[PDB]
Amino acid sequence: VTLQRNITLLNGVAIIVGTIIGSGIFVTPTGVLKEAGSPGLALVVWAACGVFSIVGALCYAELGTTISKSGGDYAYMLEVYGSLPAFLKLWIELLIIRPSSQYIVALVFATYLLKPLFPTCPVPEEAAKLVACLCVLLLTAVNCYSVKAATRVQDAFAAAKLLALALIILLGFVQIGKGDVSNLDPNFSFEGTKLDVGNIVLALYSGLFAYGGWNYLNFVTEEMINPYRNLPLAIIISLPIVTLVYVLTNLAYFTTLSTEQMLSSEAVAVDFGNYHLGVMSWIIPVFVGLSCFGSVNGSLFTSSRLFFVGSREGHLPSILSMIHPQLLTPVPSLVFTCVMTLLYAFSKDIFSVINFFSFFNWLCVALAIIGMIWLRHRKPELERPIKVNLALPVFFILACLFLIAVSFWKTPVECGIGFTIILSGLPVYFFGVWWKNKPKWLLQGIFSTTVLCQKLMQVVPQET
Amino acid sequence: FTGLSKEELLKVAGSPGWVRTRWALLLLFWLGWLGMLAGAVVIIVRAPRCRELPAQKWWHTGALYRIGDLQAFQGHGAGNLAGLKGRLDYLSSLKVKGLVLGPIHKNQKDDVAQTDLLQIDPNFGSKEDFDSLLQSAKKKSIRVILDLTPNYRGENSWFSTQVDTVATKVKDALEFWLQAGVDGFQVRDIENLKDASSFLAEWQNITKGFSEDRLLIAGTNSSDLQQILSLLESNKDLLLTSSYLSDSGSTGEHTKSLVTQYLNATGNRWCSWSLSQARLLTSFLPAQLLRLYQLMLFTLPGTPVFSYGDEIGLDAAALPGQPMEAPVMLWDESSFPDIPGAVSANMTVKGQSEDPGSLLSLFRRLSDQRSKERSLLHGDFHAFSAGPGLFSYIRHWDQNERFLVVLNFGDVGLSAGLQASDLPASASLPAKADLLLSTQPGREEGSPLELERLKLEPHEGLLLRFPYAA
Numbered sequence: 022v023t024l025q026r027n028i029t030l031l032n033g034v035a036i037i038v039g040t041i042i043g044s045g046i047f048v049t050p051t052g053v054l055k056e057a058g059s060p061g062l063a064l065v066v067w068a069a070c071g072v073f074s075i076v077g078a079l080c081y082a083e084l085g086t087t088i089s090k091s092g093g094d095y096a097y098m099l100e101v102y103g104s105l106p107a108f109l110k111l112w113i114e115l116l117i118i119r120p121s122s123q124y125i126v127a128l129v130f131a132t133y134l135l136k137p138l139f140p141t142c143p144v145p146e147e148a149a150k151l152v153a154c155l156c157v158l159l160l161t162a163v164n165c166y167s168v169k170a171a172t173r174v175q176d177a178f179a180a181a182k183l184l185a186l187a188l189i190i191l192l193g194f195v196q197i198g199k200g201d202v203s204n205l206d207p208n209f210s211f212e213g214t215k216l217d218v219g220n221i222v223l224a225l226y227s228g229l230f231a232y233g234g235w236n237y238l239n240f241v242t243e244e245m246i247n248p249y250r251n252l253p254l255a256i257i258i259s260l261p262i263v264t265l266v267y268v269l270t271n272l273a274y275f276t277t278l279s280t281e282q283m284l285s286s287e288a289v290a291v292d293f294g295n296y297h298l299g300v301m302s303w304i305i306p307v308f309v310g311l312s313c314f315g316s317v318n319g320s321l322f323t324s325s326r327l328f329f330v331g332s333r334e335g336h337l338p339s340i341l342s343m344i345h346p347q348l349l350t351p352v353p354s355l356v357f358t359c360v361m362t363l364l365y366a367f368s369k370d371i372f373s374v375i376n377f378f379s380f381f382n383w384l385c386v387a388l389a390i391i392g393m394i395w396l397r398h399r400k401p402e403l404e405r406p407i408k409v410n411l412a413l414p415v416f417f418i419l420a421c422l423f424l425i426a427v428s429f430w431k432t433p434v435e436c437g438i439g440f441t442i443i444l445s446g447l448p449v450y451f452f453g454v455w456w457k458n459k460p461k462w463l464l465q466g467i468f469s470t471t472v473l474c475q476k477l478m479q480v481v482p483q484e485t
Numbered sequence: 486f487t488g489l490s491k492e493e494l495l496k497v498a499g500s501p502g503w504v505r506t507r508w509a510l511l512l513l514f515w516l517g518w519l520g521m522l523a524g525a526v527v528i529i530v531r532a533p534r535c536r537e538l539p540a541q542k543w544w545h546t547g548a549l550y551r552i553g554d555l556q557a558f559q560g561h562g563a564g565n566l567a568g569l570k571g572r573l574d575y576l577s578s579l580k581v582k583g584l585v586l587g588p589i590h591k592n593q594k595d596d597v598a599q600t601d602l603l604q605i606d607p608n609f610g611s612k613e614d615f616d617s618l619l620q621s622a623k624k625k626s627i628r629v630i631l632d633l634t635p636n637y638r639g640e641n642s643w644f645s646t647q648v649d650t651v652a653t654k655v656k657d658a659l660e661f662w663l664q665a666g667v668d669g670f671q672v673r674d675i676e677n678l679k680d681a682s683s684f685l686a687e688w689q690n691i692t693k694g695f696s697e698d699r700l701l702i703a704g705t706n707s708s709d710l711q712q713i714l715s716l717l718e719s720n721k722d723l724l725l726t727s728s729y730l731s732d733s734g735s736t737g738e739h740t741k742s743l744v745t746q747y748l749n750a751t752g753n754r755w756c757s758w759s760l761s762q763a764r765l766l767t768s769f770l771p772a773q774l775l776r777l778y779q780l781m782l783f784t785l786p787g788t789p790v791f792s793y794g795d796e797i798g799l800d801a802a803a804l805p806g807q808p809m810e811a812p813v814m815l816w817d818e819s820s821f822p823d824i825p826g827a828v829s830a831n832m833t834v835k836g837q838s839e840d841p842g843s844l845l846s847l848f849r850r851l852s853d854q855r856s857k858e859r860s861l862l863h864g865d866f867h868a869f870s871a872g873p874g875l876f877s878y879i880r881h882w883d884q885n886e887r888f889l890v891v892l893n894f895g896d897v898g899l900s901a902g903l904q905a906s907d908l909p910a911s912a913s914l915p916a917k918a919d920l921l922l923s924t925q926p927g928r929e930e931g932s933p934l935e936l937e938r939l940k941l942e943p944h945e946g947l948l949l950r951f952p953y954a955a
């Protein structure tokens with residue numbers, strides 16, 4: 022009873038494209054322009070942040086084909102840094118990081134789905150939390166039913182958000198043809214170059230938030246069809262398409278609004294549709310809702326497959342990593358992902374985790390490439406079908422430390438708090454993992470609860 | 486590995502008693518999901534959709550800027566139209582929306598036969614320079630309003646002989662200058678016009694008959710309310726600047742009555758709030774009241790109109806050898822040629838543009854708040870009672886953050902005593918409000934203040950702010 026190998030190339034490109042293209046391209050052009058001043062400097066920041074992510078994606082394709090085991094960026098750390106510095110990543114990713122980036126995206130889906138009913142005013146809070154909860158609870162059942170269904174959902178919604186962005190490119194390339202060319206020729210009216218250090222690097226920071234999530238195909242490897250060829254091929258297909266589309270859409274934003282119309286807005290896509298449609302202008306917040314509905318489906322899959330793999334080693338309880346036969350899906354991992362996600366609907370301020378999210382993100386990507394170069398000498402006998410020339414990691418590995426320095430020195434008061442939350446996973450480790458031979462008051466209880474959940478969900482262990 | 490295998494589970498977990506309960510769990514799940522959906526829809530329809538945006542025009546968003554004598558705006562020699570094109574980045578920093586240009590046509594004197602409203606004076610510029618000024622301001626998003634009073638050099642401004650020829654040449658000038666591409670007109674001193682009420686309606690009918698994006702401004706010297714309302718009988722979409730506000734005013738209980746009575750007599754229409762038709766604020770006010778009126782004119786429900794130099798506190802009664810209708814603008818310290826040294830460093834544009842406690846530093850923040858927030862733009866006005874000498878009012882639109890303005894026109898210190906007691910349930914003031922700015926230095930900015938022990942200093946005005954809640 023193995024899982025399967027049923028993800029092709031075309032189902033692999035969708036997992037990356039639909040997870041990168043979320044709500045960043047419909048919000049963050051205000052922020053990068055507000056911290057960059059000029060349109061022409063933003064239009065080159067949105068390529069300088071693109072090629073950086075192409076470099077890091079190629080290096081993760083190296084690391085993925087080398088260590089070809091699932092739960093990537095955690096299996097690549099467990100092989101290198103041991104048991105405890107892998108439990109320290111797995112403890113943060115199930116408690117804070119994964120069950121906040123799904124609730125936030127579900128909330129964005131909800132508040133943009135009900136946007137054509139309330140314009141001059143905002144949507145109600147309890148009416149949007151319930152739609153976010155319905156968005157989570159429907160997709161977890163779709164994922165528990167089958168895997169070939171949860172791939173065809175993502176295939177539809179990635180193409181839906183691609184058509185939605187191509188609509189904006191087409192509406193921009195008509196206003197380019199209407200000879201209203203007040204920008205993009207007489208440009209660089211601010212140039213915003215240097216306050217003391219922080220004017221170009223902060224635009225890079227926001228643009229690098231806009232490009233996130235290109236390493237989720239590593240979470241779903243050991244489930245692809247032919248992962249020795251298709252894992253780098255899907256990434257190489259997926260990333261520069263996102264780069265060119267992100268450049269062309271921002272170029273289409275400047276031929277409609279002026280700079281001050283873009284800086285004081287809340288959603289540049291909404292003001293774009295207000296200008297260029299007038300009537301049938303309710304299409305654009307519908308498509309932003311569909312674009313955030315694809316990403317929750319994309320993230321539940323990989324979070325379930327990560328907490329599956331993290332229990333095969335013994336870091337997590339053993340009711341996780343037990344497939345249900347017939348409709349071979351890891352049910353008690355998906356149930357756990359969904360419940361832990363819905364637990365963050367009782368927080369009244371949920372957007373206050375994005376800084377810790379980005380800091381933890383760049384720190385663990387740094388740890389991974391340090392481990393890759395440290396292992397390339399330490400075990401130079403493994404089969405590497407795709408081998409990368411060096412100094413592509415090194416230029417990436419120094420710039421990751423520079424980004425940790427930026428994320429650390431923009432708000433230290435919260436990053437130290439998150440460092441304490443990271444350090445809070447030690448007593449759980451020494452109670453569950455390192456303290457072998459627990460007493461019979463616990464070893465009967467753990468086994469009986471596992472048997473109870475097995476008789477509830479009809480699940481067998483993974484033995485193939 | 487910490488439980489059953491496959492075969493033992495297929496033994497025990499295949500019996501009735503264990504399959505009926507899991508189908509009951511599926512029934513309970515798909516019954517809870519539809520219950521949540523029904524609760525969401527019931528919460529949605531039992532809520533307040535939205536209000537309505539009131540379809541604003543361009544002169545509703547910010548303030549207009551009147552430039553009377555063009556030679557004195559920049560200086561001698563370069564007192565031409567193309568010189569002003571080098572000044573538009575200052576005006577765009579002031580965030581004005583309009584520019585009421587002075588009268589530029591050929592007018593010799595009282596000879597009606599050689600006043601042509603279609604020909605520009607050669608001492609101002611040429612037609613192509615005018616069109617370049619227009620298109621450059623259009624790229625800067627500033628609209629040009631052209632004054633058209635014919636005799637702008639005589640004593641009687643409307644040519645005190647017969648009226649038919651001057652009325653038919655003003656009418657003819659509109660349909661030419663609109664095709665030139667201007668965005669409105671201003672006619673001054675209409676109390677010197679014979680049957681002006683029936684003439685303004687014809688010009689207003691013509692001006693709206695080219696687009697609905699066009700304006701007409703009309704100016705008198707009358708402070709009479711019942712004479713002003715007679716101009717607005719058959720005209721409703723007219724902007725009428727006058728001397729209705731000033732006239733007096735060391736007390737605030739009299740200014741409150743003027744504002745409330747003008748709004749009640751008009752039926753809460755769109756008005757223009759200014760102190761005069763061609764004069765500066767310092768012609769009617771002391772220097773200790775320039776900030777209190779600048780806070781008041783940017784928050785009242787209408788369009789504020791200023792002349793040039795009202796942002797720097799310009800004063801013609803401080804440097805001798807100057808006309809009283811056209812003072813020189815103090816750009817730099819080397820501006821005024823005669824009496825070399827009377828001009829100071831806190832008197833100029835460059836001198837006040839770095840000091841964060843000047844007049845020009847207050848005008849910029851106020852024009853920043855006025856043209857941006859939806860409460861001051863098209864909100865509702867409600868003034869309420871206070872102590873002896875306080876003008877206190879509230880702007881509130883729908884659900885945007887409310888504004889409470891408190892002004893103390895008096896000279897003695899006193900309490901606030903904010904007894905509201907009549908303000909509606911959609912805008913009743915809370916126990917704590919923020920503080921966006923103050924007219925006098927000596928407070929702290931951003932702090933949530935309490936509206937029971939609010940004390941005020943002499944000649945002080947406050948712009949507290951609270952958001953929508955219970």
Ligand SMILES: CCCCCCCCCCCCCCCCCC(=O)OC[C@H](COP(=O)(O)O)OC(=O)CCCCCCCCCCCCCCCCC
Binds near residue numbers: 338341354473
């Ligand atoms: C809602 C339930 C859905 C079922 C899905 C699974 C839910 C349980 C997931 C628990 C995840 C907890 C992560 C942290 C655990 C510490 C790590 C560790 O101890 O090493 C593994 C370690 C290895 O044990 P092994 O299972 O022998 O491999 O397991 C333990 O030591 C277990 C002792 C600590 C357990 C703490 C769990 C607290 C939550 C309990 C929830 C009970 C739900 C029961 C559902 C049926 C009720 C009738």
Ligand SMILES: CC(C)CCC[C@H](C)[C@H]1CC[C@H]2[C@H]3CC=C4C[C@@H](OC(=O)CCC(=O)O)CC[C@@]4(C)[C@@H]3CC[C@@]12C
Binds near residue numbers: 167169171174314
């Ligand atoms: C924001 C809202 C308005 C959009 C809702 C998204 C989709 C329109 C919904 C409607 C029904 C859902 C799914 C219900 C179950 C099916 C079965 C599935 O077909 C199979 O089961 C495959 C059969 C096999 O195993 O071979 C095809 C897609 C799918 C996931 C549907 C795809 C579209 C879903 C997610």
Ligand SMILES: CC(C)CCC[C@H](C)[C@H]1CC[C@H]2[C@H]3CC=C4C[C@@H](OC(=O)CCC(=O)O)CC[C@@]4(C)[C@@H]3CC[C@@]12C
Binds near residue numbers: 511
């Ligand atoms: C809060 C937590 C503890 C509750 C967890 C309970 C599960 C959410 C329930 C809901 C309904 C249950 C089951 C209802 C029927 C079964 C048998 C299964 O039907 C088949 O095996 C058909 C075979 C096939 O389709 O090929 C469908 C999924 C499953 C495991 C369901 C999985 C989810 C179960 C265990």
Ligand SMILES: *[C@@H]1O[C@H](CO)[C@@H](O[C@@H]2O[C@H](CO)[C@@H](O)[C@H](O)[C@H]2NC(C)=O)[C@H](O)[C@H]1NC(C)=O
Binds near residue numbers: 690
């Ligand atoms: C513009 O004004 C004219 C008159 O000043 C209006 O046109 C008509 O005028 C004659 C007499 O001049 C009246 O008897 C008609 O009844 C008027 N027509 C109407 C009222 O429809 C004209 O209507 C005005 N323009 C607008 C847009 O109202």
Ligand SMILES: *[C@@H]1O[C@H](CO)[C@@H](O[C@@H]2O[C@H](CO)[C@@H](O)[C@H](O)[C@H]2NC(C)=O)[C@H](O)[C@H]1NC(C)=O
Binds near residue numbers: 676706
């Ligand atoms: C507006 O200005 C005029 C000129 O100073 C004031 O006086 C009027 O002057 C005209 C001649 O231009 C006379 O025909 C009028 O008879 C004068 N008015 C009166 C009431 O005698 C006029 O008073 C000013 N308006 C106000 C309200 O003071």
Ligand SMILES: *[C@@H]1O[C@H](CO)[C@@H](O[C@@H]2O[C@H](CO)[C@@H](O)[C@H](O)[C@H]2NC(C)=O)[C@H](O)[C@H]1NC(C)=O
Binds near residue numbers: 749750
């Ligand atoms: C407009 O102003 C008048 C007086 O300035 C307000 O007072 C009313 O005046 C009428 C006759 O003038 C009286 O019959 C009413 O009894 C007065 N009402 C009050 C409350 O004093 C009038 O209320 C104002 N208009 C509005 C709509 O408030």
Ligand SMILES: *[C@@H]1O[C@H](CO)[C@@H](O[C@@H]2O[C@H](CO)[C@@H](O)[C@H](O)[C@H]2NC(C)=O)[C@H](O)[C@H]1NC(C)=O
Binds near residue numbers: 829831832
């Ligand atoms: C610019 O600053 C000068 C110097 O402070 C001001 O002159 C002061 O005026 C006040 C009253 O207006 C007097 O109480 C001070 O004694 C004066 N200072 C000196 C050194 O004589 C001047 O008023 C300021 N400019 C303006 C336009 O107010």
Ligand SMILES: N[C@@H](Cc1cc(I)c(O)c(I)c1)C(=O)O
Binds near residue numbers: 379
């Ligand atoms: N770039 C995505 C946001 C995002 C960031 C990360 I870091 C991430 O792992 C994922 I998946 C998504 C967007 O456009 O919203």
